[PDB]
Amino acid sequence: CIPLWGVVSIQGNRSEMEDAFAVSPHFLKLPIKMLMGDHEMSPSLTHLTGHFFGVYDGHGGHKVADYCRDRLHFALAEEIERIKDELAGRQVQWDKVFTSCFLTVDGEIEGKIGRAVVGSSDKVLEAVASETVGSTAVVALVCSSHIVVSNCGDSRAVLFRGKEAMPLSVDHKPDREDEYARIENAGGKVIQWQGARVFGVLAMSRSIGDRYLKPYVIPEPEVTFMPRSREDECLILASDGLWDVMNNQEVCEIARRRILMWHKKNGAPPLAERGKGIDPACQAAADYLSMLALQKGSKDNISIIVIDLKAQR
Amino acid sequence: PTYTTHHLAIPSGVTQDEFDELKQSVVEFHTYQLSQNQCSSLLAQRIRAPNDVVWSIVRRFDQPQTYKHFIKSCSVSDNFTMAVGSTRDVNLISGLPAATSTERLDILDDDRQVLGISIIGGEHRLRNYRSVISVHGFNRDGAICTVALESYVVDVPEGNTEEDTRLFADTVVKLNLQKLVSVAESQ
Ligand SMILES: CC1=CC(=O)CC(C)(C)[C@@]1(O)/C=C/C(C)=C\C(=O)O
Ligand SMILES: [Cl-]
Ligand SMILES: [Cl-]
Ligand SMILES: [Cl-]
Ligand SMILES: [Cl-]
Ligand SMILES: [Cl-]
Ligand SMILES: [Cl-]
Ligand SMILES: [Mn+2]
Ligand SMILES: [Mn+2]
Ligand SMILES: [Mn+2]
Ligand SMILES: [Mn+2]
């Protein structure tokens, strides 16, 4: 599994940059006992490398998104260290891991969880940003086995398989039927104030941070454990600065056509150097997707990670 | 000519014995003339700090960020004497149904510790918003606490109802009073 990705993250017409992203290739050594079950076929196969992608669309300030960029994947790695101590079910197992990981991060942002120190002493306990600051997070683990998506907010991950775009997450919007009921069963109110908004303020029902709207806006994520298929083309993570102006289906096809177009003109690149850094054809598609979003008129921050899932083209 | 009636109901967060005294300032300060398709509300917050340092924060018309939420930056107009008639340009943070706001300082009474501001422009759906904050000290067996009272009146925008507007406007004012607590008790 050689990771092929490209990224573009731009401020656009916004006065502040509050989108952030993180790519970490070869980050984790997922134990095979967490992906599939042995059958009749590789004794040497005991762990499997996972690559990390995350996009974080902050709101109210940048420090929560920046924190997610700098910390979320180490949080997740630690939670997978705790399950390496042992002591189907895999779907629920991943559900827990990412639920814990996002909850751990949310608490550190809020200042309710001590953050580790480098001098091996008392874990610093302090809020990372103000009360009104927050951030979406959509996160992808890709290994040769499976794709695992963990979503919290209205950033989105769309899988292009065959010819069908398949969103790997549902937007956490306040007018979504199940979220509307959940926010009232918590004592909160949703109103229509230039969009569905919790108490007329926040236009999303889930997030990282947003202390002042606990326990209405929660950091519990939707997690999807998806087996890979030979017909998978690409996986896209983005903030809504793209999706607000572009259809899931179209985004996914443009990405593919741009990757194909690149390989037609230049061929493949040296297999030795594939993997370390951005893939030119993935880069060229993220570059093309982002310029379309601007000229379609997106006035938001726009952040796109394009991931090519084909071994060969 | 109709008028707000907030003196008739003890607002959340105050004792009956405190309202006996507060009921007087409500009719004095927090009472508005009501135009059609408008609405109003009155909010109150007990602060464990002396009513002089509370007022000392509240009166800083040029540093609203200090005791209020949702402010990214606020700028006045160079030559500033903090006199009635002044104005301030606010930029809000992201993710709000608002982006800017022009505010004019209408009441500034250091003798009675009452602050009044009218919002006169910007990009947001609270047209004709006027607010009053009055600070009221108390003493109970040598324990000096402060009760702050904030009211507002605002036009109800097209599309929404009175209770949406109260629910949104109230939510922000409570939040802002809750921060003023934390800031005053910290000094
Ligand atoms: C945070 C915010 C959002 C809006 O939509 C309206 C406005 C921009 C005026 C405001 O600054 C509101 C300020 C309020 C309610 C009170 C105050 O300042 O005493
Ligand atoms: Cl902006
Ligand atoms: Cl910030
Ligand atoms: Cl678990
Ligand atoms: Cl609604
Ligand atoms: Cl195209
Ligand atoms: Cl090309
Ligand atoms: Mn944002
Ligand atoms: Mn939270
Ligand atoms: Mn949007
Ligand atoms: Mn956005």
Residue numbers in the entry:
A (entry chain B): 186 to 225, 227 to 273, 280 to 505
B (entry chain A): 21 to 207
How do the authors describe this structure?
Enhanced ABA levels elicited in response to drought are perceived by the PYR/PYL/RCAR family of ABA receptors and the clade A subfamily of protein phosphatases type 2C (PP2Cs), which act as necessary ABA co-receptors in ternary complexes. In the resting state, PYLR/PYL/RCAR receptors display an open ABA binding cavity flanked by two highly conserved loops, named as gate/CL2/β3-β4 loop and latch/CL3/β5-β6 loop. Specifically, both gate and latch loops define a surface that enables the receptor to dock into the PP2C active site. The formation of receptor-ABA-phosphatase complexes causes the dissociation of different PP2C-SnRK2 complexes and abolishes PP2C-mediated inhibition of the SnRK2s, triggering ABA response.
In contrast, a fourfold increase in the IC50 of ABA was determined in the synthetic receptor compared to its WT. The synthetic CsPYL15m receptor displays a similar chain of stabilizing interactions as AtPYL10 along the five mutated residues (left and middle). First, we selected a dimeric receptor and designed a series of mutations that increased its affinity for the synthetic ligand while reducing the affinity for ABA.
